[PDB]
Amino acid sequence: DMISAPWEASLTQAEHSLIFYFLALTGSALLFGLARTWLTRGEVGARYRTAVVARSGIMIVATLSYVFMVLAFTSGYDHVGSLWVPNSEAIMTIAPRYVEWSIAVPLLSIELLSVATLSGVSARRTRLAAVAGAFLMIFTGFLGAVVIGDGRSVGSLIIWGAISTVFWIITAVILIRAIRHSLPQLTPEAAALLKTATIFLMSGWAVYPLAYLIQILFAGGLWTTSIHIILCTADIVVKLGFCGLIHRIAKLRTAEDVRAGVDIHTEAIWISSVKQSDAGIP
Amino acid sequence: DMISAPWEASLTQAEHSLIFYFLALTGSALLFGLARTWLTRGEVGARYRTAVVARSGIMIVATLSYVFMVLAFTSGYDHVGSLWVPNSEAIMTIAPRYVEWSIAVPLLSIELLSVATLSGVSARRTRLAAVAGAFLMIFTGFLGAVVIGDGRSVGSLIIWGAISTVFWIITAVILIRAIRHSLPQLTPEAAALLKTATIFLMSGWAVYPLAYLIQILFAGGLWTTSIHIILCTADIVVKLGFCGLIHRIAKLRTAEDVRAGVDIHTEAIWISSVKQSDAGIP
Amino acid sequence: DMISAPWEASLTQAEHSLIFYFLALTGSALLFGLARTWLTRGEVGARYRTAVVARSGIMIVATLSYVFMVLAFTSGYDHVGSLWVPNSEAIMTIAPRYVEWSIAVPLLSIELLSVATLSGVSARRTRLAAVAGAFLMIFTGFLGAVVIGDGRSVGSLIIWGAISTVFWIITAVILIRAIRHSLPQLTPEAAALLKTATIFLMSGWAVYPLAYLIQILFAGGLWTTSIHIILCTADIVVKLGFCGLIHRIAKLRTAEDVRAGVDIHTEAIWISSVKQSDAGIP
Amino acid sequence: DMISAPWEASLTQAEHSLIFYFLALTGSALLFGLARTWLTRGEVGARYRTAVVARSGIMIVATLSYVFMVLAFTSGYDHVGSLWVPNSEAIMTIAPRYVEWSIAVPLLSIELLSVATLSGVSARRTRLAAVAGAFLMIFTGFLGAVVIGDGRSVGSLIIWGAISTVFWIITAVILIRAIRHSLPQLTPEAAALLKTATIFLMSGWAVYPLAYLIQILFAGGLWTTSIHIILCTADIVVKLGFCGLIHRIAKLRTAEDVRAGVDIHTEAIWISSVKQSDAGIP
Amino acid sequence: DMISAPWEASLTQAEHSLIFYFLALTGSALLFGLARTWLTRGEVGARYRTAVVARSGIMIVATLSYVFMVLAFTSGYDHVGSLWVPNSEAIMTIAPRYVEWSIAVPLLSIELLSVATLSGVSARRTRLAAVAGAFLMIFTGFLGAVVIGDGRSVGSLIIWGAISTVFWIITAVILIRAIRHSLPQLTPEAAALLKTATIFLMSGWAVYPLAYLIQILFAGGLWTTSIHIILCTADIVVKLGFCGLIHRIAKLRTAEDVRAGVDIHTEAIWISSVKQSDAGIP
Numbered sequence A, B, C, D, E: 001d002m003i004s005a006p007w008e009a010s011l012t013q014a015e016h017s018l019i020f021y022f023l024a025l026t027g028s029a030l031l032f033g034l035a036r037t038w039l040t041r042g043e044v045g046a047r048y049r050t051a052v053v054a055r056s057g058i059m060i061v062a063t064l065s066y067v068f069m070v071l072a073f074t075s076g077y078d079h080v081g082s083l084w085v086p087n088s089e090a091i092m093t094i095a096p097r098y099v100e101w102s103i104a105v106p107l108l109s110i111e112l113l114s115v116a117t118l119s120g121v122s123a124r125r126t127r128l129a130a131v132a133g134a135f136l137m138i139f140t141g142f143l144g145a146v147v148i149g150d151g152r153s154v155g156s157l158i159i160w161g162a163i164s165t166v167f168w169i170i171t172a173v174i175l176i177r178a179i180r181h182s183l184p185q186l187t188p189e190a191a192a193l194l195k196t197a198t199i200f201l202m203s204g205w206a207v208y209p210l211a212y213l214i215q216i217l218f219a220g221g222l223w224t225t226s227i228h229i230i231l232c233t234a235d236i237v238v239k240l241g242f243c244g245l246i247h248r249i250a251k252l253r254t255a256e257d258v259r260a261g262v263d264i265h266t267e268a269i270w271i272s273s274v275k276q277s278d279a280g281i282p
């Protein structure tokens, strides 16, 4: 059976207005996040800088995606009477997310493993399996949602969607295994935070499959609005929220190492206005 | 009853000229503010860096909003005689402010609490209640002013406006309570400044509801000009003005801590060409 | 009586070619000054960083104004024969300067007072009176030149121009008074430079009123070219020239303080390949 | 004989959707790479900074190329039915790669020699022969593929392609000779990595000639898609992958020198979460 | 006699393709150069930082010029049949170079004098005479080539070209005199390099007059291609090549001063993988 695609829906001006709000709010919040990332990048040790690098990629790629999308929104719908009607650049208000997620979902996995206690080359097996699994999960979604059937085929959404769901299970079982190994070998205070950051990431990722069910089941401008709102909201929460949580863990670990002799940090580490470690000279 | 919207008004060339001035002046002043923020970002301790991060978000989001708005101004009105007549991209000379305020008003609240003396459960509870309350106040305005009724419904402005006014009261009672707790536990010199910064922020926020009354009551190009002038002016005063006042407080607090042993700062802190603290090595 | 406006003149191709060269040479030279400002910003102390901040805004706002004016030149005139004929975006090749000057003229005043010896009530009173007076002088020009008769009214140029000339006198009497107070309390070497920088600024500001007399008196593409050449040239001289002169004074003062114990600088200060002060550690 | 060019093919919507994905994915991944480069640029000694500089050029040039290409994609094909028919700006979705490769392939050669053990004069002969040979190999490809015959001449692809293949052999024999000389004079641990980085670079370069065989042999939108996919994929692997491998070698060498007295590094060097060297003060 | 101008020639697709290559290659190489400049800016003493500042201006102005030119190329010629036919914005593919050279040729002169041994105020006489002479040489070219006659007048090319050639002689006699004075007072090793850098700059400048002879003598798309190729190539060689040679001299001089007590540098200086100087603390 055939279903209209999400970018083949005429939008009212309450729908058009919300969609521009959330697209522009999401791009804004991720440019804040990018700035924050840069300003706070020296609170973390060089042992834990992979976390900073990940997060900077996540924020750059996502900010660009959202600019593209906001500019395609302006040039993707033509107002006819009281309703905005999609043209051929309307697909460019939706498709560009898959490019963002293609980089970000792998980088979120890398950021999480950044602050775990895996080292050397068994680390590398886990980082690669994660980056693969993550990338394959998005790309197989892209194919169902955008490429094969042109977004308009229920069977192609269900097949490529199911396949994507398998790489979700594989990626999540790799990460959750990595973290379960680490928690014993961290300090109690960090292990606590790393458990929570793992629950926050996996939980965030469960929201995104729901946008894909809408596309299968419901078509309309209401629902095209629902999709954008859901996905925009989830990007803000899961990319501001989670990337601030890993940074606390990096800082706390950095400080723990300072206190222990493992290394020396130029500034002091203050987490929650509690000094974790003092500044030091080589 | 129905009222024409603000972006649905034909502008004379004196009105068009003023509107471009102020939009372009505001974006300019906030790019200065962004630069200033970066250049002075190392005058503050790591204990107080949340203040720098907030202010940088406030300036980035706002600068972008104002670029969008200035570019939409050029492509949103067509000169047809002695009048500039609005296109369908003239909503985009007004609506993008709500996106800015959605990030900024929460970040201004965070910046203010940055330099207060709050820690524990109560700190995080207070930061979240503030960020929520602030965000909800803007968004409920957006809905009245832009989305529901299309800006052209008096009942939708009065209902969504009243609702927004409740989240104003809730947000302001949270912040004013937080600050009232802190002033005892600061030093006299900082407590003085934190009282003043609180009065300057709350007072600034009372200006923005007046732009919203115009939209309810008066329609015309005079009044569309009045709205932009009011809102542009208020952004300059309350974003340049207030974010420079919190930076003095962060600096003064940073220095107070240096002097006290709590921490060490690489450079000396000068506050009104008065040296507050000397430079130090770990 | 009526006069055509400067942006209502048909330019030849010699006139059109010289106006793009000067408009693009001014944005190019003010992007070199933005780079010079950032590369040479740690040669000055933290007692005199209010000068690095003022100059960075004077060069960021000015480069953004000249990019817009060069982009609106490409889309503001149409070649209809051997003549470039103005559109409705031709006002945007002239008007954007008033936005630049609105930020810059106040910031130039701040930069000059940066390196003077004012502190107390008198300092803040002086900085505010200057920033006000400067801003009011430009804005009252904008109204005469762009807004009130559409640039086409001789009485509106002479009235708003006279008013602007009063805020010039007020602003210049404030600054010259501030500097006259400082010169006694500086060192001979700096006092000398601060006198010269004051003469260079006031003298630079006297050029800009001449562009405004042309607009009153003469209309033509020759004269529209004369205006742009005059104003572009003056921006280069007074914004490259003067902002390099204050930086020497900041450096010399920084070094004088180093030598005196007042503070310590990480690098040495070399002014004219002559070493003023050595590097030092806290 | 004549062959249609790759930019003269009508793409289906699945072929346009893939092509936009990969172009946008590649530009995204190279902006991550650029960020990474900047954030990690102080892990390396000043003796080995040429490696950082190379890699930064590689990432900047390539990111820009890919932006151009993504913007030309939007404005290079027009949807006329179920097909995206090529405009005259569809050559600009392919040609800009040759500009990227013209800078990058020489810079990749420089980056590889960066971490080898060459003197500083006989170094120069090798660096120049490499940069020449590399540049000549791309440019002679450009001429066959784009300029002479207009991409549509089989004899011009085979002649200019063969010529390009000779500068490949010359460039690769210079580099492989340089590295074979160095491996003895490195430490075992670095020599190992430098062998692998050499195999990874030469192997990466063998993929790009296959895109050029497609252009000779096969024409279609399938094949225009195959070309972009191949070339995009190879850019990600060989520019993210290889430029991270040289950075490990620079770091390991930097640390080896620290440990040996040759120099001192401000931070510690952690590679695979193993401290290679401690931080130190002059 | 009247000669067609260089932007009044219909380009083939081979000539259009080359022109886009070289414009895009030159802008690319100068963005690399800009990056390089920033990454290596701390290898030089503060005594010699004028060299860094010059070079950064040279790279910024030139990169922007080349972006403008590449964007004007896309929108300056229309494909009509088998030929690209110039529109009225084809002059913007050639004219913008004069703006670049107007800043750069003066800054190249400043960079060269940066590392010579002139100090105080007799330095200033030489720096001003140079910057004047250089600026006047370009501007008088612009007038012959672009403004007077519209590029189409042989007598205006020969008169304004001859005049430009006089300011070349004056500028070169000032610089060569300055350098001849310095070589005695440098160290043998630096004097050697400063002689070579002087020969490389003067020699580079002799290439640019040849583009101007073509414009006088030959008109055609072959020749419009020859002009762009010549000028693009010369920009790459003389702006990458020369600005890397002055940086070696600054570094070598910086190190010589370190070794001598004149100053202290934070990093070590390595030139050709030979440690020139060690890192030091105040």
Ligand SMILES: *C/C=C(C)/C=C/C=C(C)/C=C/C1=C(C)CCCC1(C)C
Binding pocket: A101, A104, A105, A108, A137, A138, A141, A142, A161, A164, A165, A168, A204, A205, A206, A208, A209, A210, A212, A235, A238, A239
């Ligand atoms: C910052 C962006 C993030 C974390 C994006 C996450 C996206 C997913 C986890 C998507 C998962 C999907 C499935 C498992 C099934 C249906 C298709 C997808 C791609 C939406």
Ligand SMILES: *C/C=C(C)/C=C/C=C(C)/C=C/C1=C(C)CCCC1(C)C
Binding pocket: B101, B104, B105, B108, B137, B138, B141, B142, B161, B164, B165, B168, B204, B205, B206, B208, B209, B210, B212, B235, B238, B239
């Ligand atoms: C920098 C921007 C700031 C501080 C913006 C502030 C905006 C408000 C405080 C808006 C308040 C409103 C009401 C309380 C009622 C009417 C609707 C609003 C959104 C204008």
Ligand SMILES: *C/C=C(C)/C=C/C=C(C)/C=C/C1=C(C)CCCC1(C)C
Binding pocket: C101, C104, C105, C108, C137, C138, C141, C142, C161, C164, C165, C168, C204, C205, C206, C208, C209, C210, C212, C235, C238, C239
């Ligand atoms: C960098 C820009 C500067 C210093 C601009 C200065 C502008 C003025 C000093 C303008 C003065 C004017 C008058 C006093 C009378 C006529 C109108 C003005 C605005 C041109």
Ligand SMILES: *C/C=C(C)/C=C/C=C(C)/C=C/C1=C(C)CCCC1(C)C
Binding pocket: D101, D104, D105, D108, D137, D138, D141, D142, D161, D164, D165, D168, D204, D205, D206, D208, D209, D210, D212, D235, D238, D239
């Ligand atoms: C990051 C980009 C890289 C490494 C690009 C590499 C490109 C080549 C090595 C191309 C080689 C070619 C031949 C040797 C023959 C056919 C033509 C070329 C240009 C594709």
Ligand SMILES: *C/C=C(C)/C=C/C=C(C)/C=C/C1=C(C)CCCC1(C)C
Binding pocket: E101, E104, E105, E108, E137, E138, E141, E142, E161, E164, E165, E168, E204, E205, E206, E208, E209, E210, E212, E235, E238, E239
């Ligand atoms: C990086 C750019 C540089 C060094 C440009 C240099 C340009 C010249 C030296 C031009 C010289 C000319 C003459 C002396 C005569 C003919 C006209 C000119 C402008 C081409």
